[PDB]
Short mmCIF file of C-alpha atoms and ligand atoms in Angstrom, two decimals:
data_model
loop_
_atom_site.label_atom_id
_atom_site.label_comp_id
_atom_site.label_asym_id
_atom_site.label_seq_id
_atom_site.Cartn_x
_atom_site.Cartn_y
_atom_site.Cartn_z
CA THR A 62 -195.06 -62.16 87.62
CA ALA A 63 -191.55 -63.63 87.71
CA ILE A 64 -189.85 -64.31 84.37
CA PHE A 65 -187.31 -67.14 84.21
CA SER A 66 -185.35 -65.50 81.38
CA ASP A 67 -184.93 -62.21 83.28
CA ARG A 68 -182.82 -64.16 85.81
CA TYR A 69 -181.12 -67.18 84.28
CA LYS A 70 -179.01 -67.85 81.21
CA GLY A 71 -178.62 -71.40 79.88
CA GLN A 72 -175.20 -73.02 79.58
CA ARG A 73 -174.94 -76.73 78.76
CA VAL A 74 -177.58 -79.47 78.82
CA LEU A 75 -177.19 -81.52 81.99
CA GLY A 76 -179.24 -84.49 80.85
CA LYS A 77 -182.88 -85.44 80.86
CA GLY A 78 -185.00 -85.96 83.92
CA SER A 79 -188.59 -86.88 84.63
CA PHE A 80 -191.20 -84.65 82.95
CA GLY A 81 -188.62 -82.67 80.89
CA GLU A 82 -184.96 -81.87 80.13
CA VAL A 83 -182.42 -80.65 82.72
CA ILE A 84 -180.48 -77.52 81.71
CA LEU A 85 -177.52 -76.08 83.65
CA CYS A 86 -178.10 -72.36 84.07
CA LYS A 87 -176.52 -69.27 85.51
CA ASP A 88 -177.96 -66.30 87.45
CA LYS A 89 -177.31 -63.11 85.39
CA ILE A 90 -176.37 -61.31 88.58
CA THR A 91 -174.64 -63.51 91.08
CA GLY A 92 -173.19 -66.04 88.72
CA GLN A 93 -174.60 -68.93 90.76
CA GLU A 94 -175.12 -72.07 88.71
CA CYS A 95 -178.32 -74.13 88.89
CA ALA A 96 -180.00 -77.20 87.41
CA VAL A 97 -183.22 -76.19 85.72
CA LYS A 98 -185.69 -78.87 84.72
CA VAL A 99 -188.11 -77.62 82.06
CA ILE A 100 -191.55 -79.21 82.07
CA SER A 101 -193.30 -78.66 78.75
CA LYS A 102 -196.91 -77.72 79.59
CA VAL A 105 -197.10 -83.14 80.47
CA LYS A 106 -200.44 -82.97 82.32
CA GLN A 107 -200.82 -81.45 85.79
CA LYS A 108 -202.56 -84.23 87.77
CA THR A 109 -203.89 -81.87 90.47
CA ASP A 110 -205.15 -78.30 90.78
CA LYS A 111 -202.91 -75.45 89.59
CA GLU A 112 -203.48 -74.32 93.18
CA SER A 113 -202.30 -77.64 94.65
CA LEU A 114 -198.99 -77.15 92.85
CA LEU A 115 -197.74 -73.82 94.19
CA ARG A 116 -198.56 -74.95 97.72
CA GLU A 117 -196.49 -78.12 97.44
CA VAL A 118 -193.73 -76.20 95.65
CA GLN A 119 -193.86 -73.74 98.50
CA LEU A 120 -193.58 -76.56 101.02
CA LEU A 121 -190.72 -78.20 99.06
CA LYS A 122 -188.74 -74.91 98.96
CA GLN A 123 -188.44 -74.97 102.73
CA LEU A 124 -187.47 -78.58 103.40
CA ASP A 125 -183.78 -79.31 104.12
CA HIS A 126 -181.97 -82.64 104.18
CA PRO A 127 -178.45 -83.67 103.21
CA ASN A 128 -179.99 -86.49 101.16
CA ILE A 129 -182.74 -84.54 99.39
CA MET A 130 -182.30 -82.33 96.35
CA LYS A 131 -182.60 -78.64 97.17
CA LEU A 132 -185.28 -76.77 95.17
CA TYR A 133 -184.60 -73.03 94.83
CA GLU A 134 -187.24 -71.57 92.54
CA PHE A 135 -190.33 -72.35 90.53
CA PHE A 136 -191.29 -70.56 87.33
CA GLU A 137 -194.24 -70.97 85.01
CA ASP A 138 -194.86 -69.29 81.68
CA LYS A 139 -197.63 -70.01 79.16
CA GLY A 140 -195.99 -73.10 77.72
CA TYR A 141 -193.60 -74.42 80.37
CA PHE A 142 -192.69 -74.97 84.03
CA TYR A 143 -189.23 -74.18 85.33
CA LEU A 144 -187.89 -76.00 88.37
CA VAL A 145 -184.70 -74.24 89.43
CA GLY A 146 -182.64 -76.40 91.77
CA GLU A 147 -179.13 -77.29 92.90
CA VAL A 148 -176.33 -78.90 90.83
CA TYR A 149 -174.87 -82.27 91.78
CA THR A 150 -171.84 -83.27 89.72
CA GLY A 151 -171.03 -86.85 90.85
CA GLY A 152 -173.68 -88.40 88.53
CA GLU A 153 -175.96 -91.40 89.26
CA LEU A 154 -175.16 -93.92 91.97
CA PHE A 155 -175.10 -97.05 89.75
CA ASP A 156 -172.93 -95.46 87.01
CA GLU A 157 -170.42 -94.95 89.79
CA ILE A 158 -170.65 -98.43 91.35
CA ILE A 159 -169.98 -100.13 87.99
CA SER A 160 -166.68 -98.23 87.92
CA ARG A 161 -165.83 -99.68 91.33
CA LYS A 162 -163.76 -102.85 91.29
CA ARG A 163 -164.67 -103.92 94.79
CA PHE A 164 -168.24 -103.55 96.19
CA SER A 165 -169.22 -104.90 99.61
CA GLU A 166 -172.25 -105.42 101.88
CA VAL A 167 -171.08 -102.45 103.96
CA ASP A 168 -170.88 -100.20 100.91
CA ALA A 169 -174.46 -101.12 99.94
CA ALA A 170 -175.66 -100.57 103.50
CA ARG A 171 -173.99 -97.16 103.52
CA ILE A 172 -175.84 -96.38 100.30
CA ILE A 173 -179.25 -97.57 101.52
CA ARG A 174 -178.89 -95.92 104.92
CA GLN A 175 -178.44 -92.66 103.08
CA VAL A 176 -181.56 -93.33 101.01
CA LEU A 177 -183.67 -94.24 104.03
CA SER A 178 -182.65 -90.98 105.74
CA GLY A 179 -184.04 -88.66 103.06
CA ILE A 180 -187.11 -90.82 102.79
CA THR A 181 -187.91 -90.76 106.52
CA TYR A 182 -187.49 -86.99 106.64
CA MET A 183 -189.76 -86.47 103.62
CA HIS A 184 -192.43 -88.75 105.05
CA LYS A 185 -192.41 -86.86 108.39
CA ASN A 186 -193.36 -83.96 106.17
CA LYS A 187 -195.91 -86.13 104.33
CA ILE A 188 -194.28 -86.08 100.90
CA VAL A 189 -194.46 -89.28 98.85
CA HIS A 190 -191.99 -89.91 96.02
CA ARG A 191 -193.64 -92.86 94.25
CA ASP A 192 -191.06 -92.93 91.40
CA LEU A 193 -187.94 -93.64 93.46
CA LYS A 194 -185.38 -95.35 91.12
CA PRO A 195 -181.57 -95.45 90.44
CA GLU A 196 -181.65 -92.45 88.05
CA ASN A 197 -183.25 -90.33 90.85
CA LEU A 198 -180.21 -90.96 93.02
CA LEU A 199 -177.40 -88.55 92.10
CA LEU A 200 -174.12 -88.23 94.03
CA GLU A 201 -173.11 -84.77 95.37
CA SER A 202 -169.51 -84.97 94.21
CA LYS A 203 -167.00 -86.92 92.14
CA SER A 204 -165.75 -89.25 94.88
CA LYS A 205 -167.00 -92.68 96.02
CA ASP A 206 -168.11 -91.65 99.53
CA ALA A 207 -170.15 -88.60 98.48
CA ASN A 208 -173.67 -88.16 99.86
CA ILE A 209 -176.60 -89.17 97.71
CA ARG A 210 -179.28 -86.69 96.72
CA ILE A 211 -182.75 -88.06 95.93
CA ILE A 212 -184.26 -86.24 92.94
CA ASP A 213 -187.92 -85.38 92.16
CA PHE A 214 -189.24 -86.20 95.67
CA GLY A 215 -192.74 -84.67 95.42
CA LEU A 216 -192.92 -84.18 91.63
CA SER A 217 -195.43 -86.95 90.85
CA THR A 218 -198.32 -86.01 93.15
CA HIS A 219 -198.73 -83.36 90.43
CA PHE A 220 -197.65 -84.68 87.01
CA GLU A 221 -198.65 -87.56 84.78
CA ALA A 222 -195.89 -89.74 83.30
CA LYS A 224 -196.27 -92.86 78.35
CA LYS A 225 -193.45 -92.37 75.81
CA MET A 226 -191.27 -95.52 75.97
CA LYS A 227 -188.27 -93.28 75.21
CA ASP A 228 -188.66 -92.12 78.77
CA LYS A 229 -190.66 -94.26 81.19
CA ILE A 230 -187.73 -96.72 80.73
CA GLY A 231 -186.26 -98.74 83.58
CA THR A 232 -189.24 -97.88 85.80
CA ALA A 233 -191.21 -101.14 86.10
CA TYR A 234 -188.57 -102.78 88.26
CA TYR A 235 -189.21 -100.37 91.10
CA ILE A 236 -192.90 -99.42 91.27
CA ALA A 237 -194.82 -100.84 94.26
CA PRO A 238 -197.64 -103.26 93.39
CA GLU A 239 -200.16 -101.02 95.12
CA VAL A 240 -199.13 -98.06 92.96
CA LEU A 241 -200.22 -100.19 90.01
CA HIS A 242 -203.70 -100.81 91.39
CA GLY A 243 -204.23 -97.20 92.41
CA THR A 244 -204.32 -97.16 96.19
CA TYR A 245 -201.06 -96.19 97.77
CA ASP A 246 -199.28 -94.15 100.47
CA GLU A 247 -195.69 -93.38 101.57
CA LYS A 248 -195.08 -97.12 102.01
CA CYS A 249 -194.53 -97.45 98.22
CA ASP A 250 -191.17 -95.58 98.68
CA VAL A 251 -190.10 -98.29 101.09
CA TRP A 252 -190.97 -100.97 98.59
CA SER A 253 -188.89 -99.19 95.90
CA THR A 254 -185.91 -98.98 98.25
CA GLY A 255 -186.06 -102.74 98.82
CA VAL A 256 -185.92 -103.44 95.12
CA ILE A 257 -182.80 -101.23 94.95
CA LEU A 258 -181.30 -102.84 98.08
CA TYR A 259 -181.90 -106.24 96.39
CA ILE A 260 -180.19 -105.13 93.16
CA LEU A 261 -177.11 -103.87 95.03
CA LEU A 262 -176.68 -107.21 96.77
CA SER A 263 -177.14 -109.31 93.62
CA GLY A 264 -176.91 -107.19 90.47
CA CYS A 265 -180.40 -108.53 89.68
CA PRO A 266 -183.89 -106.99 89.98
CA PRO A 267 -186.14 -109.08 92.24
CA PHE A 268 -188.81 -108.81 89.57
CA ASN A 269 -187.56 -109.32 86.00
CA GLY A 270 -188.77 -110.17 82.50
CA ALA A 271 -188.45 -109.80 78.72
CA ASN A 272 -190.45 -106.55 78.46
CA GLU A 273 -192.33 -103.90 80.49
CA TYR A 274 -195.59 -105.84 80.95
CA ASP A 275 -194.02 -109.12 82.04
CA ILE A 276 -192.02 -107.23 84.65
CA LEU A 277 -195.19 -105.51 85.82
CA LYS A 278 -196.81 -108.96 86.04
CA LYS A 279 -194.00 -110.15 88.26
CA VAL A 280 -194.36 -107.02 90.38
CA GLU A 281 -198.11 -107.25 90.77
CA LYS A 282 -197.83 -110.93 91.72
CA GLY A 283 -195.10 -109.74 94.06
CA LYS A 284 -193.18 -113.00 94.57
CA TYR A 285 -189.38 -113.28 94.41
CA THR A 286 -186.55 -115.48 95.73
CA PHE A 287 -183.05 -115.53 97.13
CA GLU A 288 -182.47 -118.63 94.99
CA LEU A 289 -179.60 -117.15 92.99
CA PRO A 290 -175.95 -118.02 93.71
CA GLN A 291 -175.10 -114.43 94.63
CA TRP A 292 -177.03 -114.67 97.93
CA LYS A 293 -174.68 -117.07 99.68
CA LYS A 294 -172.12 -114.41 100.52
CA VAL A 295 -175.02 -112.17 101.51
CA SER A 296 -175.85 -112.30 105.20
CA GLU A 297 -179.26 -113.28 106.56
CA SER A 298 -179.67 -109.88 108.26
CA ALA A 299 -179.84 -108.17 104.90
CA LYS A 300 -182.25 -110.76 103.49
CA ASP A 301 -184.38 -110.05 106.54
CA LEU A 302 -184.51 -106.32 105.83
CA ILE A 303 -185.24 -106.93 102.17
CA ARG A 304 -188.06 -109.26 103.20
CA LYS A 305 -189.72 -106.68 105.40
CA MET A 306 -189.42 -103.94 102.78
CA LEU A 307 -190.79 -106.18 100.00
CA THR A 308 -193.78 -107.06 102.05
CA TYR A 309 -196.83 -107.01 99.82
CA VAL A 310 -199.57 -105.47 101.97
CA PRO A 311 -198.41 -101.89 102.66
CA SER A 312 -199.78 -101.89 106.22
CA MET A 313 -197.71 -104.99 107.04
CA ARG A 314 -194.75 -103.39 105.22
CA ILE A 315 -192.03 -101.89 107.42
CA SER A 316 -191.86 -98.07 107.55
CA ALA A 317 -188.84 -96.06 106.41
CA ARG A 318 -187.99 -95.04 110.00
CA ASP A 319 -187.90 -98.63 111.21
CA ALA A 320 -185.68 -99.68 108.30
CA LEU A 321 -183.03 -97.43 109.92
CA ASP A 322 -183.34 -99.14 113.34
CA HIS A 323 -183.01 -102.58 111.67
CA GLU A 324 -180.08 -104.79 112.68
CA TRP A 325 -178.46 -104.69 109.22
CA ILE A 326 -178.33 -100.88 108.96
CA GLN A 327 -177.25 -100.21 112.53
CA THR A 328 -174.65 -102.99 112.20
CA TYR A 329 -173.09 -102.51 108.75
CA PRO A 339 -165.95 -109.60 102.23
CA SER A 340 -166.69 -108.56 98.62
CA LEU A 341 -169.46 -109.32 96.12
CA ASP A 342 -167.84 -109.70 92.71
CA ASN A 343 -170.93 -111.33 91.25
CA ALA A 344 -173.21 -108.42 92.08
CA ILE A 345 -170.76 -106.04 90.37
CA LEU A 346 -170.52 -108.18 87.23
CA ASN A 347 -174.33 -108.39 87.11
CA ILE A 348 -174.94 -104.76 88.01
CA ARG A 349 -172.63 -103.81 85.10
CA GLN A 350 -174.55 -105.96 82.68
CA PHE A 351 -177.81 -104.37 83.98
CA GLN A 352 -176.54 -100.79 83.69
CA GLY A 353 -175.14 -101.31 80.20
CA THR A 354 -178.27 -102.97 78.97
CA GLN A 355 -180.29 -100.13 80.52
CA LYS A 356 -177.96 -97.46 79.15
CA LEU A 357 -177.95 -98.97 75.65
CA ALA A 358 -181.72 -99.52 75.25
CA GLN A 359 -182.05 -95.87 76.26
CA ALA A 360 -179.47 -94.68 73.76
CA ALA A 361 -181.06 -96.83 71.09
CA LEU A 362 -184.37 -95.04 71.72
CA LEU A 363 -182.85 -91.51 72.00
CA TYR A 364 -181.13 -92.11 68.68
CA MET A 365 -184.41 -93.01 66.98
CA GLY A 366 -185.92 -89.89 68.57
CA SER A 367 -183.12 -87.68 67.25
CA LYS A 368 -183.51 -89.18 63.77
CA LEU A 369 -187.22 -88.28 63.58
CA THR A 370 -186.86 -84.82 65.16
CA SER A 371 -185.16 -83.85 61.91
CA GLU A 374 -187.32 -80.81 61.38
CA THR A 375 -185.19 -80.30 58.27
CA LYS A 376 -188.49 -80.16 56.40
CA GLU A 377 -189.03 -76.81 58.12
CA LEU A 378 -186.85 -75.40 55.32
CA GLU A 422 -175.04 -67.88 69.58
CA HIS A 423 -174.78 -68.10 65.77
CA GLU A 424 -172.67 -71.23 65.26
CA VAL A 425 -173.63 -71.01 61.58
CA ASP A 426 -169.93 -70.18 61.33
CA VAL A 448 -178.47 -78.17 55.60
CA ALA A 449 -175.78 -78.73 58.23
CA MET A 450 -177.89 -81.50 59.72
CA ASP A 451 -175.05 -83.90 58.94
CA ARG A 452 -173.22 -82.37 61.90
CA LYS A 453 -176.00 -83.26 64.36
CA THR A 454 -176.33 -86.82 63.00
CA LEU A 455 -172.68 -87.70 63.63
CA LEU A 456 -173.10 -86.34 67.17
CA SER A 457 -176.01 -88.75 67.74
CA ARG A 458 -174.21 -91.68 66.09
CA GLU A 459 -171.47 -91.42 68.75
CA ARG A 460 -173.81 -91.27 71.78
CA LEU A 461 -175.28 -94.50 70.47
CA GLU A 462 -171.78 -95.83 69.67
CA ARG A 463 -170.53 -95.03 73.14
CA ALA A 464 -173.31 -97.02 74.74
CA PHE A 465 -172.74 -99.84 72.24
CA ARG A 466 -168.98 -99.99 73.07
CA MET A 467 -169.66 -99.78 76.78
CA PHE A 468 -172.18 -102.64 76.55
CA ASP A 469 -169.68 -104.77 74.57
CA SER A 470 -167.49 -105.40 77.56
CA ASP A 471 -165.43 -108.26 76.07
CA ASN A 472 -164.64 -105.89 73.20
CA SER A 473 -165.81 -108.48 70.67
CA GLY A 474 -167.32 -105.85 68.43
CA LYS A 475 -170.61 -107.65 68.23
CA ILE A 476 -173.70 -108.34 70.24
CA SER A 477 -175.50 -111.67 69.95
CA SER A 478 -179.12 -112.16 68.88
CA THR A 479 -179.77 -113.12 72.47
CA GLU A 480 -178.33 -109.84 73.72
CA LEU A 481 -180.41 -108.15 71.08
CA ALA A 482 -183.59 -109.86 72.35
CA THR A 483 -182.84 -108.53 75.82
CA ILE A 484 -182.02 -104.99 74.58
CA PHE A 485 -185.00 -104.63 72.24
CA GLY A 486 -187.09 -106.18 75.05
CA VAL A 487 -186.54 -103.40 77.61
CA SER A 488 -187.03 -100.88 74.80
CA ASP A 489 -190.34 -102.52 73.76
CA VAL A 490 -189.64 -103.31 70.15
CA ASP A 491 -191.64 -106.32 69.02
CA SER A 492 -189.44 -109.42 68.83
CA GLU A 493 -190.80 -110.06 65.35
CA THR A 494 -190.28 -106.46 64.33
CA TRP A 495 -186.54 -106.12 64.81
CA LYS A 496 -185.80 -109.68 63.59
CA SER A 497 -187.51 -108.75 60.33
CA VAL A 498 -185.55 -105.48 60.15
CA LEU A 499 -182.37 -107.47 60.84
CA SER A 500 -182.79 -109.62 57.68
CA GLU A 501 -183.39 -106.41 55.72
CA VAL A 502 -180.00 -105.04 56.84
CA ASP A 503 -177.87 -108.09 56.30
CA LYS A 504 -179.39 -111.36 55.11
CA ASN A 505 -176.29 -113.37 56.12
CA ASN A 506 -175.67 -112.65 59.78
CA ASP A 507 -175.31 -115.66 62.07
CA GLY A 508 -177.03 -114.02 65.01
CA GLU A 509 -174.54 -111.23 65.71
CA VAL A 510 -174.48 -107.61 64.69
CA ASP A 511 -171.64 -105.17 64.56
CA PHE A 512 -172.29 -101.59 65.59
CA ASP A 513 -172.97 -100.37 62.06
CA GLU A 514 -175.59 -103.07 61.57
CA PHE A 515 -177.23 -102.22 64.90
CA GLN A 516 -177.31 -98.58 63.75
CA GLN A 517 -178.84 -99.70 60.42
CA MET A 518 -181.55 -101.64 62.33
CA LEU A 519 -182.59 -98.75 64.56
CA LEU A 520 -182.89 -96.47 61.54
CA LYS A 521 -185.12 -98.94 59.77
CA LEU A 522 -187.14 -99.32 62.96
CA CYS A 523 -187.94 -95.59 62.72
CA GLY A 524 -189.07 -95.09 59.15
CA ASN A 525 -185.56 -94.93 57.76
N1 5G9 B 1 -185.16 -86.36 86.95
C1 5G9 B 1 -184.38 -85.30 87.17
N2 5G9 B 1 -184.83 -84.13 87.56
C2 5G9 B 1 -183.80 -83.27 87.85
C3 5G9 B 1 -184.16 -81.96 88.42
C4 5G9 B 1 -183.44 -80.80 88.16
C5 5G9 B 1 -183.86 -79.59 88.70
C6 5G9 B 1 -185.00 -79.52 89.48
C7 5G9 B 1 -185.72 -80.68 89.70
CL1 5G9 B 1 -187.24 -80.60 90.53
C8 5G9 B 1 -185.30 -81.89 89.20
C9 5G9 B 1 -182.53 -83.78 87.66
C10 5G9 B 1 -181.22 -83.21 87.97
C11 5G9 B 1 -180.97 -82.48 89.13
C12 5G9 B 1 -179.70 -82.08 89.39
C13 5G9 B 1 -178.68 -82.41 88.48
N3 5G9 B 1 -177.40 -81.95 88.70
C14 5G9 B 1 -176.48 -82.24 87.78
C15 5G9 B 1 -176.72 -82.97 86.62
C16 5G9 B 1 -177.99 -83.42 86.39
C17 5G9 B 1 -179.00 -83.14 87.33
N4 5G9 B 1 -180.29 -83.54 87.08
S1 5G9 B 1 -182.64 -85.42 87.08
#
């Protein structure tokens, strides 16, 4: 009968993760800091006996590229995953800040990723949801080791809410979609990510979730973009073997390490330009949805002090998370995003093309297919019952 609260005190929110929010916390005794994910009792997809056993297994595994899990707590309405803190943020968010990115840098990234994977598979743990946000860097620098997050989480939890579940279709193996899968799906995911690092472009793309899924399920892609000239044929080989449709024919994680490209390994300015566009788009569609979530959550109809109808305070604080992602997406500092850029943004956030366009004419009848930030804000609000 272990109580989470009798051990840990919350500090600041660290972000959101799969299945719940991530809260930085501190041991009331030893002062050690930890990242707690809280899973709001989300449906357990297996026995409540299958969980503790896997959790138990996970507590004992150790790899420089795998997140360390320290403790598991459950009360009547929640699950608490107490783990380690990694401060260097997500891989991609870093790379976009780089000014040079090369084939050797990507290889050094992937080789990390394949290490954790291989180790986990030896121990028969599948990830299934491997994606950029589940790759955090240990420290601030640009040669810090990568930790894979949530490895093992999804054999036990389900998910739906487009707020979350965002940016995931690019990476899921076709076989995951049809229901029959094994550890080979984590190899397929890695290939998508390898591909994106060498091109700035997902191998399977589209205007919304379903059309991406359709590309994935059909499973065909090309190197017929400009960006692939500078990219060696050794890499394209590895990519090919990892993005091999039938899982049994697909190359294992172990063997991806012994591949010529990894063992072996200019600059790729195009990939960086593209990867920046991808991250910003991703980051802004997310913010756009969080914002709409925050706006509904107030409730102010249910009517650490910090008292010292002050909802106005927490609306300005949400305006500027949105605004930050807007500014960061507007990289030419024009102040405006085009209707085209809108179509893309509302696409990955699954707002009906006809829905926002209508809302847009409600906000300002005389726009010529560009919105400033305030107009964008006005649109989102109207898209959420405001
Ligand atoms: N999807 C995510 N799940 C977690 C998570 C957190 C604790 C336990 C478990 Cl099982 C998972 C994340 C995490 C992990 C470390 C972090 N360290 C610094 C900042 C954010 C962090 N976020 S992201």
